[PDB]
Design a protein around this ligand. Structure first.
Ligand SMILES: CCCCCCCCO[C@@H]1O[C@H](CO)[C@@H](O)[C@H](O)[C@H]1O
Ligand SMILES: CCCCCCCCO[C@@H]1O[C@H](CO)[C@@H](O)[C@H](O)[C@H]1O
Length: 334
């Protein structure tokens, strides 16, 4: 066991191993708060997240377990992974707090085109990394569901990692089927998000900046066009088909004037209403737009992820015990 020290942060006592220094609050959420810190043991800037009352209820407890399981699973250059997880508790009986440590890359894509659009060469590099990481996540049978610029961290060398779990420092990037509570989501919900992000990097402007939910959907329909006959067959409701026909084309092509035609071709393949017809991450990696970076020998897939817990309805004490097990078994990365 490491030596811990105590300090008041974000309105509670944080108790952390001595290696983590210079904690500074950077965020809080309903479920946790984050400090930036410096890990004197590895020389890395890190984010330390202290969960807030991780076992307050069955739902909190399951969320805590899910977050830790997902972070422990992720071992890929373009996906955030778990550098450390700890608790000052010395037994399951004392176990009440959980702290998660991840890389702090130092910036994200959220600010990035406020001032000007990116070059085509730089968009190739960033989107390539997003898709390389998404191929990995998808191969584990995991769907991100909330890809957006603030969930894409980059360092000074513009190496990129996909984030989640409130490490991000809007519905503009959400697949329309998620907004329409469709359920039965495909992984290509995330490909829609990548298309929205890529479009914005190339043009310097949000692709679908809706003011509210229905506005978001109206903007999408204006740009990609009304559902064709094949997609209309997959929508049960006659009234819904009538209603979309009433809101429903602005040129997709006119949005991307001056762009690399290979970029536009890829955007057209990502931003397809019918999720069954969107390009996959793996397919996208092979598209000619990425010829400078694609290497099939180094676009690795994930170990399969045991998601049995997702469908379980367990008691708090069981979720808490399962979480404690995962804390104790953690082995830090190379
Ligand atoms: C702006 C457009 C307004 C209406 C959007 C269409 C609503 C589609 O609705 C969805 O259709 C699916 C297929 O039948 C169902 O399985 C889903 O339960 C349902 O949510
Ligand atoms: C903008 C208003 C219309 C939105 C239509 C969105 C259609 C998304 O696509 C749908 O996704 C479902 C879930 O994966 C699939 O089961 C369907 O087969 C697929 O067509």
């Amino acid at each position: 066991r490491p030596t811990f020290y105590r300090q008041e942060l974000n309105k509670t006592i944080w108790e952390v191993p001595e290696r983590y220094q210079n904690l500074s609050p950077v965020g809080s959420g309903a479920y946790g708060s984050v400090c930036a810190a410096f890990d004197t043991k590895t020389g890395l800037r890190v984010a330390v997240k202290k969960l807030s009352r991780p076992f307050q209820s069955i739902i909190h407890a399951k969320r805590t377990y899910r977050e830790l399981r997902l972070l422990k699973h992720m071992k890929h250059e373009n996906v955030i992974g778990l550098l450390d997880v700890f608790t000052p508790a010395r037994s399951l009986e004392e176990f009440n707090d959980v702290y998660l440590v991840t890389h702090l890359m130092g910036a994200d894509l959220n600010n990035i085109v406020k001032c000007q659009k990116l070059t085509d060469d730089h968009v190739q590099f960033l989107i390539y990394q997003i898709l390389r990481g998404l191929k990995y996540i998808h191969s584990a049978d995991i769907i991100h569901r909330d890809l957006k610029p603030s969930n894409l961290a980059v360092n000074e060398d513009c190496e990129l990692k996909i984030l989640d779990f409130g490490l991000a420092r809007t519905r503009w990037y959400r697949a329309p089927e998620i907004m329409l509570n469709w359920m039965h989501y495909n992984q290509t919900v995330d490909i829609w998000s990548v298309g929205c992000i890529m479009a914005e990097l190339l043009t310097g402007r949000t692709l679908f900046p809706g003011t509210d939910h229905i506005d978001q959907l109206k903007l999408i329909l204006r740009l990609v066009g009304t559902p064709g006959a094949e997609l209309l067959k997959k929508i049960s409701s006659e009234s819904a088909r009538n209603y979309i026909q009433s809101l429903t084309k602005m040129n997709f092509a006119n949005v991307f004037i001056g762009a690399n035609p290979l970029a536009v071709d890829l955007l057209e393949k990502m931003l397809v209403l019918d999720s069954d017809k969107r390009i996959t991450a793996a397919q996208a990696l092979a598209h000619a737009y990425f010829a400078q970076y694609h290497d099939p020998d180094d676009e690795p897939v994930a170990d399969p992820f045991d998601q049995s817990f997702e469908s379980r309805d367990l008691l708090i004490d069981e979720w808490k015990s399962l979480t404690y097990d995962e804390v104790i078994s953690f082995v830090p990365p190379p």
